[PDB]
Amino acid sequence: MPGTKRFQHVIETPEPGKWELSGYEAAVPITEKSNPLTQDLDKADAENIVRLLGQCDAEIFQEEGQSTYQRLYSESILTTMVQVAGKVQEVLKEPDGGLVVLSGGGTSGRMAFLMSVSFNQLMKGLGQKPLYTYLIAGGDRSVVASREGTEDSALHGIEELKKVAAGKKRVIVIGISVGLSAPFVAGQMDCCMNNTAVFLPVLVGFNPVSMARNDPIEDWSSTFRQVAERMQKMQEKQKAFVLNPAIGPEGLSGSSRMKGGSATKILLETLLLAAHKTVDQGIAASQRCLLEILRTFERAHQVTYSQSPKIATLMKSVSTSLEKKGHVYLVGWQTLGIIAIMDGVECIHTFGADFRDVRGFLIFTFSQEDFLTSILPSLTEIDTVVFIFTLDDNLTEVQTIVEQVKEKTNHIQALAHSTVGQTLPIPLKKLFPSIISITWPLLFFEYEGNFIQKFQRELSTKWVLNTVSTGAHVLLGKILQNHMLDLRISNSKLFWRALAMLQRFSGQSKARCIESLLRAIHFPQPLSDDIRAAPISCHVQVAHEKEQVIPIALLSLLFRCSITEAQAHLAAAPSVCEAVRSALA
Ligand SMILES: O=S(=O)(N[C@@H](c1cc2ccccc2s1)c1ccccc1Cl)c1ccc2c(c1)OCCCO2
Numbered sequence: 001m002p003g004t005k006r007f008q009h010v011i012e013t014p015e016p017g018k019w020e021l022s023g024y025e026a027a028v029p030i031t032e033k034s035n036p037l038t039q040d041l042d043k044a045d046a047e048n049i050v051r052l053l054g055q056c057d058a059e060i061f062q063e064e065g066q067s068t069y070q071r072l073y074s075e076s077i078l079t080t081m082v083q084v085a086g087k088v089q090e091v092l093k094e095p096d097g098g099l100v101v102l103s104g105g106g107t108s109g110r111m112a113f114l115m116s117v118s119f120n121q122l123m124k125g126l127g128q129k130p131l132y133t134y135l136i137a138g139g140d141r142s143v144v145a146s147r148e149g150t151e152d153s154a155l156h157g158i159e160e161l162k163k164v165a166a167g168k169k170r171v172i173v174i175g176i177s178v179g180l181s182a183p184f185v186a187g188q189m190d191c192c193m194n195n196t197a198v199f200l201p202v203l204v205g206f207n208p209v210s211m212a213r214n215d216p217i218e219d220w221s222s223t224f225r226q227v228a229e230r231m232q233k234m235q236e237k238q239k240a241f242v243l244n245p246a247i248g249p250e251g252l253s254g255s256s257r258m259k260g261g262s263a264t265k266i267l268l269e270t271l272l273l274a275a276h277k278t279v280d281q282g283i284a285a286s287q288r289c290l291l292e293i294l295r296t297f298e299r300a301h302q303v304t305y306s307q308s309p310k311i312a313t314l315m316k317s318v319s320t321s322l323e324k325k326g327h328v329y330l331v332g333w334q335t336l337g338i339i340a341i342m343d344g345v346e347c348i349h350t351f352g353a354d355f356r357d358v359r360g361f362l363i364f365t366f367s368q369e370d371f372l373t374s375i376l377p378s379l380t381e382i383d384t385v386v387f388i389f390t391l392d393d394n395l396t397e398v399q400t401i402v403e404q405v406k407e408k409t410n411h412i413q414a415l416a417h418s419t420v421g422q423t424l425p426i427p428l429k430k431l432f433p434s435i436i437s438i439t440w441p442l443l444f445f446e447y448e449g450n451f452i453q454k455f456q457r458e459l460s461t462k463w464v465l466n467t468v469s470t471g472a473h474v475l476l477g478k479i480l481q482n483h484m485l486d487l488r489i490s491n492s493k494l495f496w497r498a499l500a501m502l503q504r505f506s507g508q509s510k511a512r513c514i515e516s517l518l519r520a521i522h523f524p525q526p527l528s529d530d531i532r533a534a535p536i537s538c539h540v541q542v543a544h545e546k547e548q549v550i551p552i553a554l555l556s557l558l559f560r561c562s563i564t565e566a567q568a569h570l571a572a573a574p575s576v577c578e579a580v581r582s583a584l585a
């Protein structure tokens, strides 16, 4: 029948109680799993949210049990990180015709960009020509934009990679997809494998390959799973690498901007630093060099969440403000400015949030007096501003801008990074009551820019910001258990995540879930055989423009009713969350 093919790969809903025993749960990729630590995340108060998300983030450094999935500290992963450092070094010693590309979509794209800059800085500092570049689904504009639709074309990934690989002779492509999921990446990797004279593909993600996506890519013939299975075979002769440790599920299910973005930096910074440090010394990279850096990143988590109670309070001020239709501003310098901009933007697609609700500023790139005259006027008593800097920044810009903001608003707070025994100039000191200071012990550093100091702080800020943004919106009641129910379907992955959420919360069959989702999407047009048979992009393009697609589809199933009936029920309830909660009872 029509639609049987497009949905061939979908697993049937299990009958109640045999979720485990049907083998459906064992097929849910780790990156899409519900994290059991957060099954009651929607009931936690602010301090528990922080405690629960800090605990989920720490799963990154947790070791393998005794059967089970390799992890970051497993010897198969570290031995792969070594071999990859090894190949990065071959390129470092022959920079003529050599290039290192870091490519991802969404947050994997954002991460790739940061790291390409840093390692380019490092090489400038040594007087060598920069060898790093990034690639982000949707071009470079995507780095600071919410643009979830762009990851779905393989050809587009292959074009972008063909532009940048110019007339180079040895190219390392590090494709980053947390879920081993994005067709953008899949196409790059497959292309590298069709020309291993020039290309070396390295695939980075956090699912076992056996959970990689296996649904058809619209412009391509292989699935992500097949591409990855073929890379893994090539690794035996060291012509491709798959670097995929499990790091456990996300605190908010499928939200791979959190743990997944963090692990991506931890994993790649570690490995590239190791490679640079050890070329200088004319020594091969080794597990022991990687470990030093890895443990430093793991100290960084401890150091960061030891400041939890102040994180919980920044959380509340952020949540309070948005409950009143207020706005929230994130202001910081150099690379922490950017990380602020990334976090705010991600709130758009993650929570259905307006660009103004949580916006980030770099001193989007609005400098000292430009921000004073432009943004400063339009503030208000309920808003919130957050300053993010090190005590090595122009601390004179800092004090100024806060002084003016303290006039137009009082819900300020800040995030400050210091080496130990650095002190807060007394004007600045006095403007912040409960302040978030994070002091970093002395560490001896090989290079001029102190790149390891940079990485720790970027990462620690990421964790604080992500925990605040996510926590703030959970507090508002917009998350259901640990799922975001009311997402906007803007790509095929989210299409599937929606369908899985319908199977999970409805318990009804695969065919009914799918029918209800397509009706919801395409309403007011009815299911035709064309629509049943259409490629997933057709449903995505139409869902992307609508509101409450998933809750409307769920209600339809629970009440066993039409789309007309569920829509009017929804509009006759105080809110979405309210209506779904009641219906779930
Ligand atoms: O497209 S898939 O090959 N892989 C999908 C998913 C697969 C899958 C399987 C069970 C439950 C949820 C999900 S989501 C995938 C894999 C890695 C990273 C992200 C994503 Cl979306 C697929 C496989 C099976 C699916 C399914 C999708 O739709 C969801 C409902 C269950 O059936």
Ligand SMILES: O=P(O)(O)OC[C@@H](O)[C@@H](O)[C@H](O)[C@@H](O)CO
Residues within 6 Å of the ligand: 104, 105, 106, 107, 108, 148, 151, 176, 177, 178, 179, 180, 181, 182, 254, 255, 256, 257, 258, 346, 349, 350
């Ligand atoms: O790295 P992946 O699995 O290929 O995910 C690619 C992007 O969709 C992902 O980063 C997404 O943008 C974020 O909103 C996840 O919270």
